[PDB]
């Protein structure tokens, strides 16, 4: 539970958080449900914090009759929608609910139908990134970001990546089926070791610049 070790320095940040302050754009949204997704919706995800969500309709209108009150411009988003909405973030906004009875158990998963802060762009955002292949990869300053969609076919998703998992590729190497976040750049440089479908090593968290 507490520090079982001592490193020479603190980590630069936790996934979903902001390291650098600058021009940023973020929007609120409701988490919806992959079950409510009308189409097959293959990719499955637990609303993890460092995931890139997609727009899936609006919930502005309130009521059940013809006269409906548009109370707010509310966005209704899903974890792996093709229409990229924003990378979920700012975990301090939310309330910890625990996991399976233990109310104080660690949890980075937002419950379904909750409200999240989806950064559309940020000077620096800590994101969990993954490997798009089974081989070792090196990400540098000039590296791009693409997130797994909801309808990624089983043949393309051989590694069994999560629903909204941001991958991180090199120019002209986007793993197949993956959709790209425009103008997204890997700022800090890291190395991901070789992985398999069963292992699926969690790629080390990275500072990224979006738009």
């Amino acid at each position: 539970m507490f520090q079982k070790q001592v490193y020479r320095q603190y980590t630069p940040g936790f996934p979903g958080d902001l390291i650098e302050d600058g021009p940023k754009r973020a929007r609120p949204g409701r988490i919806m449900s992959l079950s409510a997704v009308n189409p097959a919706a293959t990719a499955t995800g637990p609303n993890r914090i460092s995931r890139a969500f997609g727009y899936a309709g609006d919930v502005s209108a309130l009521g059940e009759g013809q006269p409906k009150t548009i109370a707010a411009r509310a966005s209704e988003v899903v974890i792996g929608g093709a229409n990229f909405f924003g990378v979920l973030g700012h975990p301090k906004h939310y309330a910890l609910f625990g996991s399976a009875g233990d109310s104080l158990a660690p949890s980075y998963d937002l419950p379904d139908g909750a409200e999240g802060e989806f950064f559309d762009m940020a000077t620096g955002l800590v994101v969990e990134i993954f490997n798009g292949a089974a081989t070792a990869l090196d990400l540098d300053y000039g590296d791009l970001v693409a997130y797994v969609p909801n309808n990624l076919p089983t043949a393309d998703n051989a590694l069994g990546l999560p629903a909204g998992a941001l991958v991180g590729f090199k120019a002209g190497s986007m793993p197949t089926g993956l959709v790209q976040i425009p103008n997204a750049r890997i700022v800090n440089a890291i190395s991901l070791p070789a992985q398999s479908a069963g292992n699926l090593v969690a790629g080390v968290t990275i500072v990224q610049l979006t738009q």
């Binding site: 919806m32 309130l62 059940e64 013809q66 379904d112």
Partner: protein, 272 residues
């Protein structure tokens, strides 16, 4: 406090049965149990950006830009709060924010004895009102007397004028209501019209409910409010940002919807 994520209300049930008295006889005991209900809290925000020349040229037509935008921010947050209070906020997606027409503990909407007030005569409307009062008396097990209790009749705005339906002798529904139930208060709301759909025809809504119950009749140490709009704050100045040739003002409000703590004191009719 605009900050908390949930609101919790507790209900206590006592239990105890008396026995015939005797010395040296075993003492009968009593006990209690408690249950809890929780609702979530929704925060809305609204702001306004004002430039310098924008104000300068708005003042030419004798209009204050910043005042109008601040008033519109307040009114938009009020619309948000009222819509949440009447319909909840994403109650169907798992959020536990419910409204005056959406509370799960509320009794189901019932078809009135008269099919609709558009065609029903004075006898029909007063019969519907009397049957609702009958249901209210039965549900409370004769603990709430509607003759001397403050009771609210919430109506759709499209059917309140039907309280003016008269007989050939000049007896309106209003005379019968205000003479039979002098403490009854009639309120009309636009949100109560077209609450649900039957077949391409909006159904209007009538809600009978007791405003307050005395602490004597129930023993509650709560306040006795059947319905409560749990509003954290109607208006907070989140902050201001003075920049060189413009400034931004940002406000917010919070609301947890509506909570019905006494479902037994509510009667609902749909489709008058």
């Amino acid at each position: 406090s605009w900050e908390d994520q949930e609101i919790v209300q507790g209900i206590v049930e006592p239990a105890g049965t008396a026995v015939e008295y005797g010395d040296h006889t075993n003492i009968p005991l009593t006990s209690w149990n408690a249950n809890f209900e929780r609702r979530t809290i929704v925060r809305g925000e609204l702001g306004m950006m004002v430039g310098t020349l924008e104000e300068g040229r708005a003042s030419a037509i004798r209009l204050n830009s910043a005042e109008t935008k601040r008033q519109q921010a307040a009114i938009g947050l009020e619309i948000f709060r009222n819509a949440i209070g009447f319909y909840g906020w994403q109650s169907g997606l798992g959020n536990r924010t419910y409204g005056f027409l959406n509370d799960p503990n509320l009794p189901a909407f019932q078809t009135p004895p008269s099919q609709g007030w558009s065609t029903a005569d004075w006898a029909g409307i007063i019969g519907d009102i009397r049957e609702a009062v009958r249901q209210l008396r039965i549900q409370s097990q004769d603990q709430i007397d509607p003759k001397a209790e403050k009771i609210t009749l919430a109506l759709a705005t499209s059917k309140v004028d039907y309280l003016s339906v008269t007989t050939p002798y000049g007896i309106s529904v209003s005379d019968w209501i205000e003479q039979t139930y002098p403490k009854m208060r009639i309120v009309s709301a636009p949100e109560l019209s077209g609450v649900q759909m039957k077949a391409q025809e909006p159904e209007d809504a009538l809600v009978l409910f007791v405003e307050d119950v005395n602490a004597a009749v129930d023993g509650s140490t709560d306040g006795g409010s059947v319905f409560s709009q749990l509003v954290q704050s109607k208006f907070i100045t989140l902050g201001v940002e003075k920049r060189a040739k413009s400034y931004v003002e940002d406000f917010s409000n919070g609301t947890a919807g509506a909570l019905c703590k006494r479902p037994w004191a509510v009667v609902r009719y749909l489709g008058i």
